[PDB]
Symmetry: C2
């Protein structure tokens, strides 16, 4: 079992809303870097913070924020880049754009997450203040 | 002038073979992570090493290794992810595949590079041993 397997499990769990997997395969000490200039932007540390933030995100997006398509999983050292599309409809914003999730995986767990968006102005409006 | 501007300058310079730009906008102390299992794979530090390695790469690929298409430039903290396609024809291998370049940019310079390839088996064969 390799880092791409773990990354695929992570994406499948996001896509299918499997909180059990997400709560288990993400490190309790996860460092999560969310880009941009909206209420969830910044670096967050620990599932104590990240779990509730993911929940608030689901609330703010009326459950519509989604990785609508995953394209490629690529490994480099302990990192995996996943190229993808995400979408959503909330705060009057129709979100549809390319992104990349960067995951750092160690000992079977995602220890660091850095997200990238192709249109950060649109994503910022989506999440809101 | 922002990190995406620097990333675009970097990609344009690779694409047009502008060694002057590359030699100037890449940090002398650049940390360069090349994935896979071929003769250039591993982490390399310093332009004293990276410059000559880029030259050897051009030689090994008969000057054909190319970023054939750049798709999106995305910023997250001091990192920029560039989704792209690369191609080449060398060592009996026709290379054509998606990739992502991750650049860390500080004070106007690229200080760290991490490359990702969609088909590392094919890229490994391309570069060879
Ligand atoms: Cl998908
Ligand atoms: Cl809406
Ligand atoms: Cl292009
Ligand atoms: Cl050939």
């Amino acid at each position: 079992m390799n880092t791409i397997d773990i990354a695929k499990s992570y994406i499948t769990a996001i896509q299918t809303g499997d909180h059990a997997t997400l709560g288990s395969i993400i490190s309790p000490d996860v460092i999560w870097h969310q880009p941009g200039n909206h209420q969830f932007s910044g670096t967050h540390r620990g599932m104590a913070v990240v779990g509730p933030m993911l929940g608030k995100m689901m609330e703010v997006s009326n459950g519509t924020f989604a990785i609508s398509r995953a394209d490629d999983y690529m490994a480099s050292g302990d990192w995996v880049a996943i190229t993808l599309e995400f979408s959503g409809q909330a705060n009057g914003v129709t979100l549809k754009q390319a992104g990349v999730d960067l995951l750092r995986i160690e000992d079977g767990k995602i220890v660091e997450v850095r997200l990238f968006s192709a249109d950060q102005t649109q994503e910022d409006a989506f999440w809101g203040r």
